Each structure stands twice: as structure tokens, then as C-alpha cells.
From Swiss-Prot, chain A:
GO cellular component: cytosolic large ribosomal subunit
Residues in the signal sequence: none
Keyword rRNA processing: no
Protein name: Large ribosomal subunit protein bL27
Transmembrane portions of the chain: none
SUPFAM superfamilies with a match to the protein in the record: Ribosomal L27 protein-like
GO function terms (MF aspect): structural constituent of ribosome
Family from the record: Belongs to the bacterial ribosomal protein bL27 family.
Native organism: Mycolicibacterium smegmatis (strain ATCC 700084 / mc(2)155)
Lineage, top ranks: Bacteria, Bacillati, Actinomycetota, Actinomycetes, Mycobacteriales
GO biological process: translation
Pfam families reported in the protein's UniProt record: Ribosomal_L27 (PF01016)
Cross-referenced PANTHER family: LARGE RIBOSOMAL SUBUNIT PROTEIN BL27M, RIBOSOMAL PROTEIN L27
Name of the gene: rpmA
Swiss-Prot record, chain B:
Biological process terms in GO annotation: translation
Protein name according to UniProt: Large ribosomal subunit protein uL5
Family: Belongs to the universal ribosomal protein uL5 family.
NCBIfam families noted in UniProt: PRK00010.1
InterPro entries, sorted: Ribosomal_uL5 (IPR002132), Ribosomal_uL5_bac-type (IPR020930), Ribosomal_uL5_C (IPR031309), Ribosomal_uL5_dom_sf (IPR022803), Ribosomal_uL5_N (IPR031310)
Keyword rRNA-binding: yes
From Swiss-Prot, chain D:
Range of residues in the leader sequence: none
UniProt cross-references to PANTHER family, sorted A to Z: 54S RIBOSOMAL PROTEIN L39, MITOCHONDRIAL, LARGE RIBOSOMAL SUBUNIT PROTEIN BL33M
Taxonomic classification: Bacteria, Bacillati, Actinomycetota, Actinomycetes, Mycobacteriales
Alphabetized Pfam families for the sequence: Ribosomal_L33 (PF00471)
The name this protein goes by in its record: Large ribosomal subunit protein bL33B
Tree of life domain: Bacteria
SUPFAM superfamilies, sorted: Zn-binding ribosomal proteins
Native source species: Mycolicibacterium smegmatis (strain ATCC 700084 / mc(2)155) (Mycobacterium smegmatis)
GO cellular component, one term: cytosolic large ribosomal subunit
UniProt keyword terms in alphabetical order: Ribonucleoprotein, Ribosomal protein
Coiled coil feature spans: none
GO BP: any one term: translation
The UniProt record lists the keyword Flavoprotein: no
Swiss-Prot record, chain E:
One Pfam family hit: Ribosomal_L16
Entry GO CC: cytosolic large ribosomal subunit
Species the sequence originates in: Mycolicibacterium smegmatis (strain ATCC 700084 / mc(2)155) (Mycobacterium smegmatis)
Residue numbers spanned by region Disordered: 1-24
Protein family according to the UniProt entry: Belongs to the universal ribosomal protein uL16 family.
Keyword annotations from UniProtKB, A to Z: Ribonucleoprotein, Ribosomal protein, RNA-binding, rRNA-binding, tRNA-binding
Protein's UniProt keywords contain tRNA-binding: yes
UniProt-recorded Gene Ontology molecular function terms: rRNA binding; structural constituent of ribosome; tRNA binding
PROSITE patterns: RIBOSOMAL_L16_1, RIBOSOMAL_L16_2
Quaternary structure, from the entry: Part of the 50S ribosomal subunit.
Protein name as annotated: Large ribosomal subunit protein uL16
Basic residues bias locations: 1-13
Length: 79, 182, 126, 53, 136, 75
RNA sequence: GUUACGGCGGUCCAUAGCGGCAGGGAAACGCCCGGUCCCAUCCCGAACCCGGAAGCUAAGCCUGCCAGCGCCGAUGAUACUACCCAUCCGGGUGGAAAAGUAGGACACCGCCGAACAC
RNA sequence: GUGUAAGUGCACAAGGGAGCUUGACUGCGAGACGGACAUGUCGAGCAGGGACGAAAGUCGGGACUAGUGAUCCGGCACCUCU
């Protein structure tokens, strides 16, 4: 007379965190993710948990490189 | 500074005859045997892991090169078969060693099979690759035929750049395989 | 009405080369102050370039076709060596000291390696 | 967890003239215990340890 | 009886009864069809009753197509039990039926007998429905 | 092939013991598997192997009820 | 500058693919000859590597052709929907698919090198 | 197919295989995520001393997420602290 279900796992707060256009510093986290849904491009690095981060400051551009959505960083214009 | 029998013969007569038969534009289209293949499936890998070594030794004595031991990539337990159990040995032959092997096979052993009427013309496939099989190794004088503890047959297959069975059979005829001429 | 069956080894060798070259290329980069040294080999002769992959442009060049490089007599290796000399001179004229070395989808050793080692000897930083 | 004689067993990895116990948890149904091993100690440098429990 | 041989998930939500048909709004394989007008869940036993109603009204020869199959279950839970403590087991199987959708298609020559048969099969179902000819 | 040595490789003279239509050629058959009599058939000398049987001594494609008899036999 | 050339790259990567037809080999891309030397096969100079240019453009490759296997793809309408009106129903302002259709398309672009030339 | 559940990804391979091998290191850490709080997660880059590789460069465990338990009280080795 039991429901043997009921369990669940607390969240991990995944997804995009710095969308198109924004200004990001270095080492900042663009997206947390399990697999490489989004891949790195230029001035972008990968983590251990397939997190992404910035290697050079600038601003974002979610473009594709041969069918795969990438993330990039572009040079800000110095004031 | 040397030439095997079948290869000198190949470059002398057989290319000419196939040209005069099939009338190719380029001679690059001429059919030519590439390699020869040998295999032995032990099959009792799960019951005798030592017949494998026996077969290795036989094919060593037969072909003059240490074989390859083919592992079982899948595990099918209805045969005891598990991932990595050695089931068979395999050897590739290319070049002068190949032509010498065919010379020996055609000239010593296949004229030593019991009541050899003929190898079929129907062991081909798609274009002319002849895949026959031997029950015992009691035939090669290469082998020390006193020491054998069991029959360990084998399976041979001969691959050629021929494009169809007609060209394959014609080439192998010119090279002297005893087909059943039909 | 004769017709073939399948793959020739020329096609195999070609597409495997492209396969492993664009495998390797993941790690190699390009820049006008650190360009890529591409090599493109054949049996007879050889070609090389200095590439900027930021714009897919080219800064230097050389090959064993030019009569001045055919004026070598020695082995294929010696042709390659003099080629490395020429590209060192040209690169350091056009204003490049440091580079990487892309083996272009070929194995290191033989003509490739003797080229590159001659270049390392004659000044390029790699 | 506990201290049962688990498959993943043993510990301690001591150093020769290098007293900086580096630790690792490994099995023990396999044979070996008189070869390999290396690491950086104090005041010293990349040299060779034992797995000495 | 109509049931599937196996479903992956044998405890499903209740289907939706919102929206009009997308497919099955056109007679396909016969001449004289049935078309729904409302939203409803139609079960196994209803369709059995209806096909028998038709075959006992033509009685000899003339074909009947059933463009529906009960591939979505529902869950009763046993009697006199306080709410809570889980989700009941599947007991009967429905197909959702959105308006515009076609259920049955007959092929019998005379329209008299055919229209009458379809009417007898309409009065075995919970929905308002109407009868269709393949024509425009 | 390469070290991790294979069997040894030396020439061979397969002397036709059928009708004297012998063979002779390079092979991987030698210390491994050879016979005495280094007979030079050519400019060099190399082992020989008696050939008990071969092609030109093995009838085959390459080499070479009845009632009319019953009442022949039964008269 | 330029031709049926080769090589390195790019496109928010099939408008670029697969298959069929014809056609090309000057220098180059190739295939091929052979394992002396570096080097290599979980066995095999098959591959990788080395040394050369007898032979052939048959194949790879490049060129044109075929919209056929695949792809791309609108306008307008519909579904759905935000907001508002509305005693159930339904409706108005804006947004707007998928599929389908008309069609497109046997790719385009950049750099160096050759050959060719004033 | 990915050691083990599922998903997200992986053919550009993270799948399969072979040779060396211990970075399954020490001293740190910009800036960030998530955030009641304590916990938790990644982290480029610098230094010694190394592996591999021809070099560029990668290596501070495993394709990623689970695989464990705060504080107190005791135990073992080392310290130029008392």
C-alpha cells in the first residue's frame, strides 16, 4: 500500500548567465552546462564540468561554427 | 634481382591474354591480385586455450610469418564467448611471399587433396574474390605432419582488383587454379 | 561498359590526410606575429606557407619547384633543407621570427623533419 | 564510511629522506609493492616514495 | 476488444479536450463516415458496441473501418479509499476525440441501410455526431 | 617483416619425383622446412626437396546400372 | 591580367550533398617501380617511411551537363497566443508558426603559388 | 559504444588501439556563479620541481553531474612555536 516513488534531486542552476551583448570581465562564467551544448570559440575556455568562461574581456557573440552554437568574446573599444 | 614463377608468368602471358579477351582502354584496368588471406577459427577457445598456440605454430611453419590473434569484440554467452577470448588466428600475405605461397599451394598441397574433383567457380562474391576452405592441415609438407594432435582446419580467401566474376574466374584460370571447368 | 566497384587508395590517403590535418588544426592557431607554418607534401616536390588564420591570409611561401631550388643536386632531403633556408630568409625579411609548425597531416620525420630542423638551425624559433 | 577490510584498502605513502606522507586509496587483490612512485617533498624535489602503510 | 500489447508508460495524465482536429477530418477508406462535433474520451467497449451495431445491421457483406485506437489509459483506484497514497492502476483505455475527427467509415452499397447503420452506431456513443459522404 | 622474428627464409628446389618436371624458387621455407641436396638449378646453389607428388603427376582438371552389360555378363 | 591548374582557409555550413552522362592531363595533383639508408606493422614496405620517374589519366581530382534521389523556401490564410471587450458562447488591436504551394539551387568568396604576357 | 541509473554531449570523436609514464603534485589565486547561513562549483595566470612531445602546448584525476557526514574529543609522523 506504498508509493515507492517520491524522491528527487535538488537543482544545479544550469543555463546561460551572460547573454548577448553584455560586458564580462575575465574568468567570468557565461554558461554552466553538462555537455557541450555550447562550445567555445575565441577568447573562451572550457572547464571541468563543461562550464564555459572568459579568457579575455569583451562582449558576447553566440554564433555557430559548422553547425554548432559557439560562444565568443570580442574586443571592447578602449575609451 | 629475382623473380617468382607465378609473377614472371603474370607479367608475361596473363595480362596479354586478358587484354586480348576484354579489350580494356587503359591497362590500369587490368585485373591484379593484391593480397592473400588466411584464417583459422579455433572455436574451442573456452575449452582449449592451447590449440590457439598450436594453430599459431602451424601457420608459422606454413606461411613464414607470425600470425595475428583476433580477439572477440562482442560477448555472446551461448558459446561461452567473452570480450577478448582469442577465437582465431589470421595472416595477410602480399608480394613475392604471396606468389610463392600460391605456387606452393597449387603445386604441392592442392595436388595432395583426397579425390580433388575441383574447386567450384562459385566461391566468388560481387566481383571475383575466391573464398574457399580446408578441413585439415594434413597436406602441407611444410608442416611436420607427425606431431599434429588434432585437425585444425582453415579458411582461405583470395582478393583481386577484378570487377566481376567473369574476369575473376578468367584470371584465376590463367594463373592455374583448378576450377571445375564447366 | 566496364565499371569499378569502390574506393581507391588515392582517395583513402587523401581524405585521411585531410581528416588528420583538420584534427591537428584544433590546437594550432594563426596570427601575423605568430603565424602557422603549413607544409604540403608530394612524392616529387614540396610546398610551404606562412599563414594567418585570423584572416586566412598568407605572408610567405616556398616550394621545391622553383628552378633556383632545383639547382640543388642532392637528395629530396637536401631540396627540403634549402627550402627551409629560403623560407627562413623570407620570413625574417617580411618580419616574422617566431612561428609554430604544422605538419599538415603528415608524420614528422624524413623530409618534413629535416626541413624543420634546418629552419631551427638557421634561426626560426620552434 | 567505516573501517571494514574493504576491497579499496590501504593508505600511507612515506618518503625516503622526505617526510611528507602523500596518501592514496587502492585495491589489494593485485600484486605489487616494491617499484614505481614519485612526488615533490618539503625542501626537496621530485623524488621517490614508498607506499609504506 | 481493443487494447495495445504494451505501453512504455502505463500511467499517463488525462488527455486534453482543447482544440479542433488536425487529421482525420476527411473520409479516407470508405464512402459513408462518422464525424464528431464535441470533445470526449471514447473507450474500448463503446467502439466494440458500435461495430457490432453496424455488423448486425448490414449482416452480410460491407466493410467497416475504425480510424481510432484506445492508446491512452486512465486510472481508477480501488474503492472507499481516502484520497492520497498514490495513483491508481489502469483499468480502461481511451482515445481522445477532437471535433472534426472521423471515427468510422463504412462501405456498403445502399445509402438507406448505410445511413441507418451509422445512426445506430451513433446512439451507442457519448458524443453528438453526424454522418459524412466522401464528397465535398 | 620485423624483429619478434618470424620463421627463417631461404630458397628451395622442389625436385619433381613424379616425371622430372622440377621447380625451384625463393621461399620462406628453409632451416625451418628444407631437404638436403643443394643442387644448383641456376647460377647459384640452394637446398632441395623431394616432391612425392605434384600437378603433372596428379590426375585432375590440369592432369588426366549398365543393362547392356548385365545380359552380356548373364549371356 | 588569364585558362578545364594546384594549396591554404571562410560561410551564422547541403542554395555547397549523392547518383548518372560526356570530357582533361604542358608545368603541377596524382596513381605506379623497388625496399639499399632513417623509419613501421598488435603478422604483412598494405598503411606510415625511404629512394626514382618505365608506364596511364583507368581511378582520385578539376570542367560542363541532368532538378532525379536530398536540401532551401517565401507572400497570403489557418492553428496557437499577449492585452481588452463579453452573463456561459464567442469576439476586437497587435504578434505569428508547422505543413503545403510558387519556386530556387549541380554553390559563393578570399590569399599565396604556378603556367601564361603585354 | 561510452566502467555503473538517466539526461546533456561525443564521428571535429570524450568510442577503439599502441609507446613512455605518475600532475591521482607543492605554494597560491584575479574575477565569477549559486547564494538565508554553514556547505558547494568552475577558475585563466605566476613560482619551484617534473612527465609526454621534435616543438607549439596539455597535465592541480577519471566525458559531466551521485559515490558520502559538520562540530566537539582523542590518535600517528614532522616542525627552528610555548
Amino acid at each position: 500500500s506504498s508509493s515507492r516513488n517520491g524522491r528527487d534531486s535538488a537543482a544545479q542552476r544550469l543555463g546561460v548567465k551572460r547573454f548577448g551583448g553584455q560586458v564580462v570581465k575575465a574568468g567570468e562564467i557565461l554558461v554552466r552546462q553538462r555537455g557541450t551544448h555550447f562550445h567555445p570559440g575565441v577568447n573562451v575556455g572550457r572547464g571541468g564540468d563543461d562550464t564555459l568562461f572568459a579568457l579575455a574581456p569583451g562582449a558576447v557573440e553566440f554564433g555557430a561554427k559548422r553547425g554548432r552554437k559557439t560562444v565568443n568574446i570580442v574586443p571592447v573599444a578602449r575609451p | 634481382k629475382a623473380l617468382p614463377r607465378l609473377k614472371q608468368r603474370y607479367r608475361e602471358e596473363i595480362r596479354e591474354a586478358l587484354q586480348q579477351e576484354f579489350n580494356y582502354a587503359n591497362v590500369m584496368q587490368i585485373p591484379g591480385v593484391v593480397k592473400v588471406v588466411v584464417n583459422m577459427g579455433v572455436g574451442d577457445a573456452a575449452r582449449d586455450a592451447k590449440l590457439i598456440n598450436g594453430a599459431i605454430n602451424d601457420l608459422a611453419l606454413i606461411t613464414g610469418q607470425k600470425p595475428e590473434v583476433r580477439r572477440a569484440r562482442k560477448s555472446i554467452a551461448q558459446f561461452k564467448l567473452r570480450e577478448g577470448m582469442p577465437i582465431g588466428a589470421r595472416v595477410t600475405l602480399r608480394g613475392d611471399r604471396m606468389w610463392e605461397f600460391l605456387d606452393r599451394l597449387i603445386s604441392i598441397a592442392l595436388p595432395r587433396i583426397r579425390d580433388f574433383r575441383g574447386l567450384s567457380p562459385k566461391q566468388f562474391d560481387g566481383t571475383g574474390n575466391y573464398t574457399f576452405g580446408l578441413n585439415e592441415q594434413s597436406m602441407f609438407h611444410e608442416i611436420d605432419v607427425d606431431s599434429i594432435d588434432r585437425p585444425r582446419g582453415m579458411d582461405i580467401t583470395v582478393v583481386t582488383t577484378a570487377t566481376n566474376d567473369a574476369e575473376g574466374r578468367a584470371l584465376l584460370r590463367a594463373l592455374g587454379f583448378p576450377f571445375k571447368e564447366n | 561498359a566496364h565499371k569499378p566497384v569502390g574506393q581507391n587508395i588515392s582517395e583513402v590517403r587523401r581524405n585521411a590526410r585531410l581528416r588528420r590535418h583538420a584534427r591537428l588544426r584544433k590546437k594550432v592557431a594563426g596570427t601575423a606575429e605568430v603565424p602557422r607554418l603549413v607544409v604540403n607534401r608530394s612524392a616529387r616536390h614540396i610546398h610551404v606557407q606562412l599563414v594567418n588564420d585570423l584572416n586566412g591570409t598568407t605572408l610567405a611561401a616556398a616550394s621545391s619547384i622553383e628552378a633556383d631550388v632545383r639547382a640543388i643536386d642532392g637528395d629530396k632531403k637536401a631540396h627540403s633543407v634549402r627550402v627551409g633556408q629560403l623560407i627562413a630568409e623570407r620570413a625574417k625579411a617580411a618580419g616574422v621570427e617566431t612561428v609554430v609548425f604544422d605538419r599538415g597531416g603528415y608524420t614528422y620525420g624524413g623530409r618534413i623533419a629535416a626541413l624543420a630542423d634546418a629552419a631551427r638551425e638557421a634561426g626560426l624559433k620552434f | 564510511a567505516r573501517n571494514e577490510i574493504r576491497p579499496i584498502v590501504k593508505l600511507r605513502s612515506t618518503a625516503g629522506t622526505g617526510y611528507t606522507y602523500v596518501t592514496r586509496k587502492n585495491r589489494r587483490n593485485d600484486p605489487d609493492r616494491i617499484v614505481l612512485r614519485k612526488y615533490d617533498p618539503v625542501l626537496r624535489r621530485h623524488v621517490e616514495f614508498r607506499e609504506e602503510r | 476488444m481493443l487494447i495495445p500489447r504494451k505501453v512504455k508508460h502505463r500511467k499517463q495524465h488525462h488527455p486534453e479536450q482543447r482544440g479542433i482536429a488536425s487529421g482525420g477530418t476527411s473520409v479516407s477508406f470508405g464512402d459513408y463516415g462518422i464525424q464528431a462535433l464535441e470533445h470526449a474520451y471514447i473507450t474500448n467497449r463503446q467502439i466494440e458496441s458500435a461495430r457490432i451495431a453496424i455488423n448486425r445491421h448490414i449482416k452480410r457483406g460491407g466493410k467497416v473501418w475504425i480510424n481510432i485506437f484506445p492508446d491512452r489509459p486512465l486510472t481508477k483506484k480501488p474503492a472507499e479509499t481516502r484520497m492520497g497514497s498514490g495513483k491508481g492502476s489502469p483499468e480502461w483505455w481511451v482515445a481522445n476525440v477532437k471535433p472534426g475527427r472521423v471515427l468510422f467509415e463504412l462501405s456498403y452499397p445502399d445509402e438507406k441501410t448505410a445511413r441507418d447503420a451509422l445512426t445506430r452506431a451513433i446512439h451507442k456513443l457519448p458524443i453528438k455526431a453526424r454522418i459524412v459522404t466522401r464528397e465535398e | 617483416m620485423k624483429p619478434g622474428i618470424h620463421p627463417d627464409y631461404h630458397p628451395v628446389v622442389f625436385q619433381d619425383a613424379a616425371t622430372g618436371a622440377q621447380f625451384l624458387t625463393r621461399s620462406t621455407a628453409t632451416s625451418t622446412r628444407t631437404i638436403e641436396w643443394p643442387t644448383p638449378s641456376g647460377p647459384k646453389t640452394y637446398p632441395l626437396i623431394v616432391v612425392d607428388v605434384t600437378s603433372d603427376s596428379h590426375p585432375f582438371w590440369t592432369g588426366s546400372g549398365q543393362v547392356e552389360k548385365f545380359r552380356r555378363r548373364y549371356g
